[PDB]
Amino acid sequence: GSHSMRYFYTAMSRPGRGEPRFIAVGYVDDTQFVRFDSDAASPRTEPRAPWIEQEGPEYWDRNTQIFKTNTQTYRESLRNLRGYYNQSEAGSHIIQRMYGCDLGPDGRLLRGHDQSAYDGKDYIALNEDLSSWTAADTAAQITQRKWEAARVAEQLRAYLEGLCVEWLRRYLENGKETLQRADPPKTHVTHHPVSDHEATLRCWALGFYPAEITLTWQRDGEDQTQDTELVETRPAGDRTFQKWAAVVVPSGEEQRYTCHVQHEGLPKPLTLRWEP
């Protein structure tokens, strides 16, 4: 239904070990499709999804130039922020940026995004109006002044409402057999005694795509949010994801527990119980 495109940039300084490394990766929903690493033997934008391979040489050269140029700009930016915070030239720091567009279930731009962080803390972000900024502190205020003077917001709005959506729609069509295919989770419940009067019920969700999913345990129809151990959704390595939720229950009360699964690929929500 809904879709998004995001580029994630990571620029990391490393005093004494060369110039800052710049890495960029591009995603359509939960599928990465391109990468660029300034540390590669030969820095170039490279395909990471089959459907992007059909793009011509001009695409790959244009992208490589963009990322090569960003490599230099982000190095300047790291020097600038080091200064804004009166930091030593001896520490390592990181600037991260993520931007992209969200489309609704009809193909129209739902909203745009452009956020930056410094050493893992929000630094500056383009507001939802795509015309104003929110700076985290007086340092970010300096960056804001620069960007307004350079009309950066206008450049982002043009991109987000234009090129971003146009190319996302192109990718969705070229890779429709995968990007527009939701794979439902294969589910089951396992039972692991932990003592004579308690056992662990673990609800599994495997092989699903996209990553968005909801796993919950109910006791007599009541959600066990506080007593449920939910691991982070993890990649299987074949594009799909895995996840599980576990709850320790009193031996003999297993049937009072039900696992509920919600995922875009399921013809209908699932309700499972342990089956001895």
Partner: peptide, 11 residues
């Protein structure tokens, strides 16, 4: 497709 270089404005 990524954000064009444009004016290459540093932070």
């Amino acid at each position: 497709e990524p954000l064009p270089q444009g004016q290459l404005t540093a932070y």
